[PDB]
Amino acid sequence: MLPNTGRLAGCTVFITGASRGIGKAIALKAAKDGANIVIAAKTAQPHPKLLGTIYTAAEEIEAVGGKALPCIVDVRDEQQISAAVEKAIKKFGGIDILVNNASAISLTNTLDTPTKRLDLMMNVNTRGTYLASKACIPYLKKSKVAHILNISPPLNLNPVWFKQHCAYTIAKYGMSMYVLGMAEEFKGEIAVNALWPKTAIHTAAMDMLGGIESQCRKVDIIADAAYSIFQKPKSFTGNFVIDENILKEEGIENFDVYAIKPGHPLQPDFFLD
Ligand SMILES: NC(=O)c1ccc[n+]([C@@H]2O[C@H](COP(=O)([O-])OP(=O)(O)OC[C@H]3O[C@@H](n4cnc5c(N)ncnc54)[C@H](OP(=O)(O)O)[C@@H]3O)[C@@H](O)[C@H]2O)c1
Numbered sequence: 001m002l003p004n005t006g007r008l009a010g011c012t013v014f015i016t017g018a019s020r021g022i023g024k025a026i027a028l029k030a031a032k033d034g035a036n037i038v039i040a041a042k043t044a045q046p047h048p049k050l051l052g053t054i055y056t057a058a059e060e061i062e063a064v065g066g067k068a069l070p071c072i073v074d075v076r077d078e079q080q081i082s083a084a085v086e087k088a089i090k091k092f093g094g095i096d097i098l099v100n101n102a103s104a105i106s107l108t109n110t111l112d113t114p115t116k117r118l119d120l121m122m123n124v125n126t127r128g129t130y131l132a133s134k135a136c137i138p139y140l141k142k143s144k145v146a147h148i149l150n151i152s153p154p155l156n157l158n159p160v161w162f163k164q165h166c167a168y169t170i171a172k173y174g175m176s177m178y179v180l181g182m183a184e185e186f187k188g189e190i191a192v193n194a195l196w197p198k199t200a201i202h203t204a205a206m207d208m209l210g211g212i213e214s215q216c217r218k219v220d221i222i223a224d225a226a227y228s229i230f231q232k233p234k235s236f237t238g239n240f241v242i243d244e245n246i247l248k249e250e251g252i253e254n255f256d257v258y259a260i261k262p263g264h265p266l267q268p269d270f271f272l273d
Helices: 021-031 054-063 078-092 115-140 166-185 204-209 220-230 243-249
Strands: 012-016 036-041 067-072 097-100 147-151 191-196 240-242
Touching: 012 021, 012 078, 012 115, 021 036, 021 054, 021 097, 021 220, 036 054, 036 078, 054 067, 067 078, 078 115, 097 115, 115 147, 115 166, 147 166, 147 220, 166 191, 191 220, 191 243, 220 243, 240 243
Parallel strands: 012 036, 012 097, 036 067, 097 147, 147 191, 191 240
Antiparallel strands: none
């Protein structure tokens, strides 16, 4: 795998959706440098259907070397975003990295999508990423690292990605369009980039959406790609990174260590031709 480096020692990483899955896995990689992880997600109490809370994530994060600040945050509510940001500053003194990882998905089409799901996608994905970015920016300006990373895809405008689940595509594409804009707006001050996985990534949310277990990569791959980006200087900006591509640059050749079952065919991720 791709080894930790120390770069992030004492750096504060604010990650939306770090209660489980990819978000949590990014936290754990940054955590191994002795980073401080601000966990911004909704799950404060055991739910019968989801696994893990902000508090179990916090524990995991401490067990591999980091400090964790669990905050209850629904990114649909600006007040909860700004309260967690304030808690991060009071506690840690600053924010050096924001990862906009929280998202909601519904693969329905025009007549199928209930308005409450439309709004949920628009409001968690596009709106959430904007507000989380707006709150963190004034602190990112002061960071020696200063990275914003959106988990969202390259802007691939082939009609095939819109013919179905259009609402979901627009919601995700909006996060990547903020990359396009904010990279330019904050050139020299904040690096802003997207990261997206070449393949499906094993996750209890992807299991529910997907038999699919064996066709996936480990969350380790995205964690590791995201760690690579975090070490780049502030001039690394306006990019739409794909996990596999960024790790080939860093010397990784044998990708089997990242597969759930080495050998088996892997499911292409959405939005890549
Ligand atoms: N897994 C894959 O194959 C794959 C493929 C393509 C893209 N992705 C992207 O990767 C990201 C994470 O996916 P995943 O596999 O980790 O799915 P997941 O298990 O559903 O992760 C979503 C995370 O975001 C949080 N979240 C959801 N709504 C939120 C809200 N309103 N406010 C704050 N946090 C919220 C969830 O925690 P709480 O429930 O505690 O709020 C959870 O930690 C998403 O951006 C997704 O589009 C994943």
